[PDB]
Amino acid sequence: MGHHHHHHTKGNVTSKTDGQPIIGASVVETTATTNGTITDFDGNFTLSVPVNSTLKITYIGYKPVTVKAAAIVNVLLEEDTQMVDEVVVTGYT
């Protein structure tokens, strides 16, 4: 069980490789692209939007990711150009 701290942060993008924060991720709005923002060392960004539209996030290296606008949203970056299946099942021998 990992104890998570509750702070005043808006959105959070992390990679699905090791579990680290995304630094330098291009995140913009569906209609408000001009007001696009990037992620910090912590893996979060700050953006103010009037309408409750969706937010498009992209980071050079891993697959793209999109999430709706909310007080706290977690995103996971999937490996790009890499096919890795994480499935397993046992039974009769």
Q: What is the DSSP string of 5-36?
A: P--S---EEEESSSS-B-SS-EEEESS--TT-
Token digits of residue 6: 């509750």
* Nearest by Cα to 26 from 16, 17, 15, 13: 13
Residue 20 CA to its chain's centroid (Å): 11
Q: Which amino acid is at 35?
A: N
Asked if 37 and 45 touch (Cβ cutoff 8 Å), the reply is yes
Q: What is the tally of helices (H) and strands (E) in the chain?
A: 0, 6
Domains and CATH numbers, the chain: 8-79 (2.60.40.1120)
The structure was resolved experimentally with: NMR
